[PDB]
Each structure stands twice: as C-alpha cells, then as structure tokens.
Design a protein around this ligand. Structure first.
Ligand SMILES: CCCCCC(=O)OC[C@H](COP(=O)(O)OCC[N+](C)(C)C)OC(=O)CCCCC
Ligand SMILES: CCCCCC(=O)OC[C@H](COP(=O)(O)OCC[N+](C)(C)C)OC(=O)CCCCC
Ligand SMILES: CCCCCC(=O)OC[C@H](COP(=O)(O)OCC[N+](C)(C)C)OC(=O)CCCCC
Ligand SMILES: CCCCCC(=O)OC[C@H](COP(=O)(O)OCC[N+](C)(C)C)OC(=O)CCCCC
Ligand SMILES: CCCCCC(=O)OC[C@H](COP(=O)(O)OCC[N+](C)(C)C)OC(=O)CCCCC
Ligand SMILES: C[N+](C)(C)CCOP(=O)(O)O
Ligand SMILES: C[N+](C)(C)CCOP(=O)(O)O
Length: 177
C-alpha cells in the first residue's frame, strides 16, 4: 500500500490514502491520490502535469480493471509559497484519456481545494491547457469532505471524495454507467 503501486480496487479507502499521505513526510502541502479502475478497460500512465508542486512517484504504469492506483504529490521542496496543483492523464484501452485534476493551494485565504475527472477524446497528455480546462471551464468539484459523482460519457461514471485541508486525500472510483 504505497504510492506507485496498484492494489485490489475494493481495498481503496480513506485509511490506505491516510497511510500514503503520512508516508510522504510532514510537508506543508501534499496530496495522496487513489483511483479505482472498475471501467472495464486497462489504463496506461502517460504523465502528470504540475501547475504547482512535484512528485517523486512514478505513476503506476498499468492499471487493470479491478485495480486501484496509488499516487502522491507535494509542494515544491523549497521556500516558495505554492501548493500542489496538477493533472494526471491515463490512456484507456478503448482509445480515450482519463484526466484527473487536483488543486491543493498554498493560501486558503484566496483559494480552496478542487478536483475533477473527465474523459478526453483520443490520447491526450496532461498540460497547462488541460489544467485550465479542468480547473476553470469543466465544473470541478470542491474538496469539501463530501462525495460527488458524475457521468463521464463514454459509458463511464465517476464518484470521488476530496477533503478540505492542505494535507489532502483524493479517492476516485471509475465505473461503468
Ligand atoms: C505563473 C508563474 C507566476 C507566479 C504565479 C503562480 O504560479 O501562482 C503562484 C501562486 C501559487 O498558487 P498555488 O497555491 O500553487 O495554487 C492555487 C492557485 N491556482 C490553482 C490558481 C494555481 O498563486 C498565485 O497566483 C499567488 C497570487 C495570489 C493572488 C491572490
Ligand atoms: C476569476 C477570478 C475571480 C472569480 C473566481 C471565482 O469563482 O471565485 C471563486 C469564489 C469562491 O472561490 P473559493 O475557492 O470558494 O474561495 C476563495 C476563498 N475565499 C472565499 C476565502 C476568498 O466564488 C464563489 O463563491 C463561487 C465560485 C465557485 C464555482 C465557480
Ligand atoms: C454531454 C457529454 C459531455 C461529456 C462526455 C463526452 O461526450 O465528452 C466528449 C468530449 C470529451 O472532451 P474533448 O475530447 O476535449 O472534446 C471536446 C473539445 N473539442 C470539441 C474541442 C474536441 O467533450 C465534449 O465534446 C463536450 C464536453 C467538452 C466541453 C467542456
Ligand atoms: C495584477 C496581476 C494579477 C495576476 C492574477 C493572479 O494573482 O494569478 C492568476 C493566474 C493563475 O494562474 P493559472 O491558473 O495558471 O491561469 C493562467 C492563465 N489564465 C489566467 C488565462 C487561465 O496567475 C497568473 O498567471 C497571473 C500572474 C501575474 C503575475 C504578475
Ligand atoms: C471580489 C470577488 C472576486 C475575487 C475574490 C474571489 O472571488 O475569490 C477568487 C479567487 C479564487 O479563485 P479561483 O480559484 O480561480 O475560483 C474557484 C472556482 N473555480 C475552481 C471553478 C475556478 O482568488 C483570487 O485570485 C483573488 C484575486 C483578487 C482580484 C480581484
Ligand atoms: C517553477 N519551478 C517549479 C521550477 C520553481 C518554483 O515555481 P513555483 O512553485 O514558485 O511556481
Ligand atoms: C480568472 N482567470 C483569468 C485566471 C481564469 C480565466 O481564464 P481563461 O481560462 O478564460 O483564459
């Protein structure tokens, strides 16, 4: 149950993500991400685009149906007042891209936690424009300590949870609609 591994999908829960979050170190802003693939498709990691922050974890490369991936990120390790903000992109085996936004800001006087999950047509690496789409234009969810669900199209739906603090957990399930 470490960042960079896959686990059985039915084992994903808050306690796994707490474990990942604590293993990372006590840095001011950090995130543990788990995504359960119950999509019927095999996922292959492309990349993570960091608008803010970094990770030392390799995205789990192959995520079969029935598996969840574990991942983490953290703020820049230097003295800069920035958070951990980015997009994960996986290529799904029927030809499209699963994109996951996380935003864990440095300053909660001006910003809040957000996430999003969307399917893009074709095979699309995460980048600044994708980040701007998911953050500004494609109706992200609040990291509000509540669950949110939405249809993705493509025969898929998502349900996920993000907490509100700078030590963030993000749990997402992708299932067949
Ligand atoms: C584009 C490089 C120039 C520096 C701006 C930048 O990267 O954002 C830095 C900072 C860090 O943002 P961060 O906490 O990492 O992420 C939350 C903000 N978003 C999600 C928009 C990036 O956010 C700000 O713009 C500070 C200005 C405060 C105006 C109220
Ligand atoms: C385009 C930059 C200025 C307006 C952007 C914006 O939507 O501000 C978000 C602000 C709230 O930003 P938020 O992260 O909730 O709070 C900033 C933190 N405070 C409230 C302490 C300033 O408005 C709302 O209350 C509802 C918006 C939610 C969906 C668009
Ligand atoms: C009513 C369903 C919207 C989501 C499911 C879907 O059919 O997604 C297809 C596509 C997946 O996104 P993408 O691959 O980026 O294609 C839409 C953008 N264009 C038309 C430029 C290629 O999104 C759309 O065409 C409309 C939603 C995008 C507007 C926010
Ligand atoms: C008087 C300039 C105020 C700048 C607004 C700000 O605080 O940051 C918003 C933006 C948020 O970054 P991002 O979410 O990446 O969106 C960048 C591109 N836009 C704004 C078009 C979506 O960061 C910037 O690129 C402005 C940097 C000006 C620094 C002198
Ligand atoms: C006076 C109301 C507008 C400014 C305050 C606000 O709405 O919170 C906006 C924003 C929080 O914006 P953002 O994270 O872009 O919006 C959250 C909603 N989403 C995630 C959908 C974009 O923080 C800022 O950059 C303030 C800059 C002051 C210039 C007057
Ligand atoms: C951009 N960087 C990651 C190389 C340096 C720090 O940038 P930021 O964290 O101040 O945006
Ligand atoms: C508030 N904002 C200017 C940073 C977001 C709007 O930018 P844009 O994505 O419409 O170019």
């Amino acid at each position: 149950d470490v960042a960079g591994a896959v686990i059985d999908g039915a084992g994903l829960g808050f306690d796994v993500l707490k474990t990942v979050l604590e293993a990372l170190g006590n840095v001011k802003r950090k995130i543990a991400v788990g995504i359960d693939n119950e999509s019927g498709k095999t996922w292959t990691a492309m990349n993570t685009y960091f608008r803010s922050g970094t990770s030392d974890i390799v995205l789990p490369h192959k995520v079969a149906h029935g598996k969840a991936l574990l991942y983490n990120g953290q703020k820049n390790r230097g003295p800069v007042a920035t958070g951990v903000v980015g997009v994960i992109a996986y290529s799904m085996s029927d030809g499209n891209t699963l994109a996951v936004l996380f935003s864990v800001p440095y300053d909660y006087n001006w910003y809040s936690n957000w996430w999003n999950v969307r399917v893009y047509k074709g095979q699309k690496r995460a980048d600044q424009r994708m980040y701007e789409e998911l953050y500004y234009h494609r109706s992200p969810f609040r990291g509000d300590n509540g669950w949110h669900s939405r249809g993705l199209g493509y025969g898929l739906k998502s349900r996920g949870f993000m907490n509100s603090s700078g030590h963030a957990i993000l749990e997402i399930h992708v299932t067949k609609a």
